[PDB]
Amino acid sequence: VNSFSGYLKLTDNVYIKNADIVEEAKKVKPTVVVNAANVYLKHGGGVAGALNKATNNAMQVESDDYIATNGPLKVGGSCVLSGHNLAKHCLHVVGPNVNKGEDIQLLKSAYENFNQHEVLLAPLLSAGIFGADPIHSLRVCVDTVRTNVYLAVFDKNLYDKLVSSFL
Numbered sequence: 001v002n003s004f005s006g007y008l009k010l011t012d013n014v015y016i017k018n019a020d021i022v023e024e025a026k027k028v029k030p031t032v033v034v035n036a037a038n039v040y041l042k043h044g045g046g047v048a049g050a051l052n053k054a055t056n057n058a059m060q061v062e063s064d065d066y067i068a069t070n071g072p073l074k075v076g077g078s079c080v081l082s083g084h085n086l087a088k089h090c091l092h093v094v095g096p097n098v099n100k101g102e103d104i105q106l107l108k109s110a111y112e113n114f115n116q117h118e119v120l121l122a123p124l125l126s127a128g129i130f131g132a133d134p135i136h137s138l139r140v141c142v143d144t145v146r147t148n149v150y151l152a153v154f155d156k157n158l159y160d161k162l163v164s165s166f167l
């Protein structure tokens, strides 16, 4: 049993809810919240900007030190950093950004990072300002992630379309 409430069950391991991930993280304090990161961990907008704002910029400060030491992530890659006030850990995952012309086949690689964690609160990778089709992102998630994932969907309209169209 876990703390997650109000989710629709899509599969054995994937759950979905129309919820503000910042507000969901603040309520649940999950072991892992996933950030929709870029390779520079520049948390300017979307999931990244909202999560970072909720940490009072502490996520960005920590991220800048990580990049100064390690250099950029790979598209499809990830790193584990602090969850600050939102979670124990933040898994920063880089999905491909279609608005930069990145290979959508890298979305499966991105979701494979989730399998290193037994339970996660996450957004749909490569959705929103990353430009991918969220219906596609949900299909890749279901077909790739084997651990227990609780997906928070920012738009109510999109949430209802993801549920209604789910095979």
Ligand SMILES: Cc1[nH]c2ccccc2c(=O)c1O
Pocket (backbone or CB within 6 Å): 020, 021, 022, 046, 047, 050, 123, 154
């Ligand atoms: C408070 C808040 N929460 C979000 C959660 C997921 C994606 C984008 C956002 C956003 O833009 C915003 O302002």
